[PDB]
């Protein structure tokens, strides 16, 4: 069996492929800090090869309060994604929330989006599905592996067959994720062989950011969805768990020497 | 401790009053068949004493497939809880999706719907804070019962404080539901003591609805959630696990005969 | 269909009949104590009317210190069931854990128990087999209820057929245990029918106790299996969750008033 | 921080040193077969590089069938162990149930393990201290990893300070097991920095047992536990899930491929 690829331009995200790194922030706090932040990803990702595209939020549909920082707004946010293609010739994987955003983002970027809590949102696929980009989707911490042949299913009909999913662990009691990497094989089986990425930061709600990526990577993936700030320990509030930034290509090194080592090995069958 | 009432009109809702039941069906396949179904309630209601709320949904944002059937429409829905209001003087509840759908379908009935998967999408919540209407917060299967007051809270700030949380089971592994009877108490404490209701149809994804709704409301609720389709049998689909009809009535003697039995407990401490 | 009959002596156990309470103390500390804890169940079980089955372990093979108290050993333990059988004519359960005290045990007492975490080890179960007295399976943390009719049918095996099967919860992530109520009725189904008791105080590893013994007994179960201490705030280790003995009474009020009301209900059936 | 070590003779099992196999068989059937399957094993591990230690039960003290082949029973099971150390200078790793098999196994092998279901029976443990050999603890499926400790911590008691720990998964709804990966340094750390091993085969209950066994791997242990049969298919009944003795080389190398190149990567901190 070959893999299926979800090309993102001159990028080719693929299961036997290497893997391809969706790094970048969480939520649009500032440009001067996309970019601090972003301007280290691109050195790191050209200096040690591995295919890159940033990731921020430009928007937060889910918080623990309405007074707080929404986003970025999905006009005053899609302005810099634009500065930052331009400075950097590197894509720009944005979430989206509500149908209206699809087409938008669509232009402005490269990969979009589809919101864990949303994959199971027909209004917003069969939407997101029109503009016809590369579509992310994040698994529900709620749902089974093998259920999601069917958001794939269903973004084939919204005309959209460029697809990749994306794994952030599943419940384990209350307040609680743990990642089966088992699950990453089960999806690939029931979405045509799609691109299977890992989004390892929230996966973990750490130390373990390393020890927990290198398991996943250690089984092949299209690639990793992690996030990273320059100073986590005073930013750390709450969703994500991001990376020490410095840490950043000290990290990445961890990664290739599995991505690769373990890309290139003679399919083994355990089975019979 | 006395608990909180949410009010529906001529209906007060509370954890230490007896349980009112927000009986219904899933879908609004047809009137022909909302009113049969409807029918049935308002006359063993009535006839065993026990407060009611027709619910039915008149759209569903999720399914498997988009050449399906959407839903009776934010209009021609809203039409059908109007020839259903008068004909039966029963309040209407249904859930919502989009922000625009809040203020309407709040003029059109009695309590309101927030689903779910979306029970964390702060620009819904901030819209459906605005109508000011009675919600009903489905706790979602990935959200341990504590943090329930969170969302609870950013309603208030949406100027709205008549809020009910409703119970649907917790995640238990891939693909399945099992219902945490010790997480009711744990919801009634951090909301305020806010109404809890116990959705027990989607809770089971059988012979076992019965079963399953004697040991919540051996517990103490402000009421049941439940759903239940005439021949179940031939529409046995999937998303909730509907009532067969003409049980209605026998299972409701089961409830009674408990919502009250304990509802009338001189209130016990096991805890010193 | 009807169920099965464990009868211990002059009491008839079983899932149609009225519960029977297997109260007790969890280790047997002193005599002094077992008496003046034991003194109370009988007196409230006689005067509100359920049967009994006093409970009291004369061993702890587990623990997290071996320099710790073992407990009243297999032989100086038996002997205080002795002066504790004649002083209230009330039968004895406590657990086994070497296949060689099986059969004294069985002399001395009424009904014996299997602890959870060995219900999978032959060489015991072929030995509490012998005896042929009465059993108590606990239901293992790590176990699913549809598997519980092997270990009922490699106990008929043995040559006994005289089991009852205990619920104490499962295993909800890492540390905590949920009761999945519908649980209950899958194990009567695949053990013959046989008696299914609900293990409370340790299914809660609180001011639980009742909520949470209220909902299982609305459920309908051949009886319940508490543990309670008159000091719990002092003696309070860790093992099980003893019940304020105090509050033995006003608390089995709550169950009769349940045990009854549901276990007199026309049969339903809300699968048709 | 550095790891501590529990060596087994000429072999020194440690958490940064390279990892230990301790591959083997499920039941000892025969020693025809015992053999046969040991055979491949030492070729591969000295042709590849890899640390090994035999391992098979004599016995099984759990099963759902007692009229069933217990095992080679405690005597002519070592006897087994004794033609086979001499053929092959390769140590024999079996777990004891009872605390008299304790001492004898203890002469006849080199490390002995402690059966999950049972790593909480004092009796048991204190006992399987005094011969003071190598112990290997299976983490119970039921037990957070955090709680590893206290095992540990007990056989130091018993005077026994040379123990390794195992882990195979942990329960995951009702029928299932998942390995929590970030759950292998919260044990090293609870447990004096011991070692650490992944029991691949049952953590399946398949062609998983690489990529499952890659992942664990691509984190860093003391090594693998796993287990294979010549010919899976006609004797897959239930337990373990053995590996297809062919494989056994070809599998060993995706392991060392990674063993090392993460065995040896200069230590990182994502925390700071
Ligand atoms: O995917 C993300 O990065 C985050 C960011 F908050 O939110 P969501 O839970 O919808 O994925
Ligand atoms: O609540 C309901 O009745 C159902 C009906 F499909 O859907 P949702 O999962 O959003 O609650
Ligand atoms: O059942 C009990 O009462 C207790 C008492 F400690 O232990 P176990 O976990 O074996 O049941
Ligand atoms: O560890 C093993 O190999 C197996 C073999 F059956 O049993 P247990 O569950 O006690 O570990």
Redesign the pocket.
Known sequence: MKQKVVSIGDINVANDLPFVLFG?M??LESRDLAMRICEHYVTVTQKLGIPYVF?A?FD???RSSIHSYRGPGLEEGMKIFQELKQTFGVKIIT?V?EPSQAQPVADVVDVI?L????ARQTDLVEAMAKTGAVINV?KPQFVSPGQMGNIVDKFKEGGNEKVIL?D?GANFGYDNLVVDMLGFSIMKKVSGNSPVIF?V??ALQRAQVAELARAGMAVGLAGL?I?AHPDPEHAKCD??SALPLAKLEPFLKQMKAIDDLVKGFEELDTSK
Chains 1, 2, 3, 4 share one sequence.
Not at 115 to 118: G, W
């Open positions: 970048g969480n939520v990731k939020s937060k549909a889910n979430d929330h989006q919101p864990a809590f949303l994040k994306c952030r989004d930061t929230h969805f996030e969703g994500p």
